[PDB]
Amino acid sequence: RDVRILYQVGDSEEDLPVCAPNAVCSKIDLYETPWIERQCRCPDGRTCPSSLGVEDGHTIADKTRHYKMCQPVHKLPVCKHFRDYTWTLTTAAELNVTEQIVHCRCPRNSVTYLTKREPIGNDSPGYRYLFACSPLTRLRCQRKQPCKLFTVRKRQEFLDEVNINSLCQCPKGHRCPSHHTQSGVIAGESFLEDNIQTYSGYCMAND
Amino acid sequence: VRILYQVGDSEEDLPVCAPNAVCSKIDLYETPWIERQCRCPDGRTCPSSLGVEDGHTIADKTRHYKMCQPVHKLPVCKHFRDYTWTLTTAAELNVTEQIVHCRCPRNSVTYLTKREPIGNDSPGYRYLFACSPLTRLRCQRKQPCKLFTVRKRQEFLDEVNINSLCQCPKGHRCPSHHTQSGVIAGESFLEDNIQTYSGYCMAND
């Protein structure tokens, strides 16, 4: 009974890998019909929370999603530096599995967004997706620093959801594009797993 | 779990629900909160589970709506632009009422469509919501093809929901974004930070 439970690999706790330190153990999507996707098994002597709320102290709430941790979330530092990565999502070539390691927590009402993709590195073929926390206060943009990031999700055949994050203040004599097909915007990262596509907008010459 | 009331600060200040009213609204975006709307006409109590298994819940995008009686007792909407529910907000009253008229078919999502007067002796409006199409029809001249719902999340974050309502006749294309010419301001709902825009079929190329 209760919430429909799926697994990123196989079809049961059995098929699941063991979690590394500070990894997401379960992903809860609460958009239409709430579902829980098991990522891994907690290294003992601990176990995965399954509450749909955030009261247990093991949950990171993020827009439309909840991420369950094995250890209490307060043991993680709060992020305060620029483009410190709140978490990284790694996907390996030969692995049927993906890991999401949390490095820090975004401050009150700061939303994560996909910012970078990069090769895992030496030994592993694959990619690493980087997420950061949106700025609490708005500063001046520098060259090559994006002022706007558009995240387009295909929710279904006939429903698209576009999140628009305003990152910094364009300098006098300049303005930031308002929609993602406008000029001064290029395609960023295309994380197909979540059916998302990112676009970055840069400060453009006025008029 | 965070508990709010739309009037006063306790269960005592709440009025009683009329037939088929939403008794509690739950938002699950960011930090989950529950806003108590009204007290169920006994012998019943307003459900509080965050899930949709109790049979009293309608899930819609970011939100859950709780009802006193099970949801199956409500017909499933078939006609297009049958109003799934109406939100009424009065001038003198310290409270609002959402009456549910029918259920959208699976995965289909709701959107604000019209705003008509409550009329008569009490001032205020009635907001009308309809179900999103699960099949693509050919657009009849004059009917909007695209709906844009702009919701202001926080100071530096907007969320644009774009619904595709139907297929433009050949030799025409529906607009892609809300500032493009061929789109006008639809309805505003300040309470919920939304502004809708409707797109219509335009001259191709």
What residue has token string 């002022």? A147
Q: Specify whether A98 is located in the same domain as A34.
A: no
Count, residues in chain B: 205
Contacting B with CB below 8 Å, chain A residues are 1-3, 30-34, 52-55, 61-64, 109, 111, 134-135, 138, 155-167, 178-181
CB contact (8 A) between residue A63 and residue B29: yes
Task: Say which of B30, B50, B179 has its CB closest to residue A52.
Answer: B50
Cis peptide before A121 (omega within 30 of 0): no
The DSSP result for A67-133, as a single string, is: EEESS-GGGSPBP-STT-EEEEEEEESS-S-EEEEE--B--TT--EEEEEEEE--SS--EEEEEEEE
Residues B127 and B150 in one domain: no
Resolution to one decimal, Å: 2.5
Q: How far is B34 from chain A (nearest CA, A)?
A: 11
Measured between alpha carbons, how far is A149 from A104 in angstroms, rounded to an integer? 21
Q: Provide the domain count of chain A.
A: 3
The Cα A48–Cα A27 span in angstroms is 11
Q: Which of A138, A162, A163 to mutate to test the interface with B (most CBs of B within 10 A)?
A: A162
Last residue of a domain, one of A105, A136, A167: A136
CB contact under 8 A, A159 and B109: yes
- Tell me the residue length of chain A: 207
Subunit contact A31:B61, Cβ cutoff 8 A: yes
Q: How far is CA B105 from CA B19, B59, B60, B110, B161, in A?
A: 22, 11, 11, 10, 19
A111 and A165 share a domain? Answer: no
Last residue of a domain, one of B52, B73, B94: B73
**CA-closest candidate to residue B27, choices A3, A58, A62, A30:** A30
Phi-psi region of A56 (alpha: psi -120 to 50; beta: other; left: phi over 0): alpha
- Write b or e for each residue in B78-98: b if 16 or more Cβ atoms lie within 10 A of its Cβ, otherwise e: eeeeebbbbbebeeeeeebbb
What is the domain-level CATH number for residue B35? 2.20.20.160
Range of the structural domain that residue B114 is part of:
74-134
Distance between B191 CA and the closest CA of chain A, angstroms: 19
Q: What is the CA radius of gyration of chain A?
A: 18
Can you give the CATH number for the domain in which B96 is found? 2.20.20.150
Q: How far is A121 from chain B (nearest CA, A)?
A: 33
Which residue of A3, A63, A158 to mutate against B (max B Cβ within 10 Å)?
A158
Q: B195 and B151 share a domain? A: yes
Same domain, A112 and A166: no
Would you state the structure tokens that stand for residue A127, as one six-digit string? 């990619």
**What CA–CA distance (Å, rounded) separates A133 from B152?**
18
Assess whether A132 and A191 both reside in one domain. no
Q: Which of B154, B158, B178 sits opposite A109 (nearest CB)?
A: B154
Are A2 and B53 a contacting pair at CB < 8 A?
yes
The technique is: X-ray
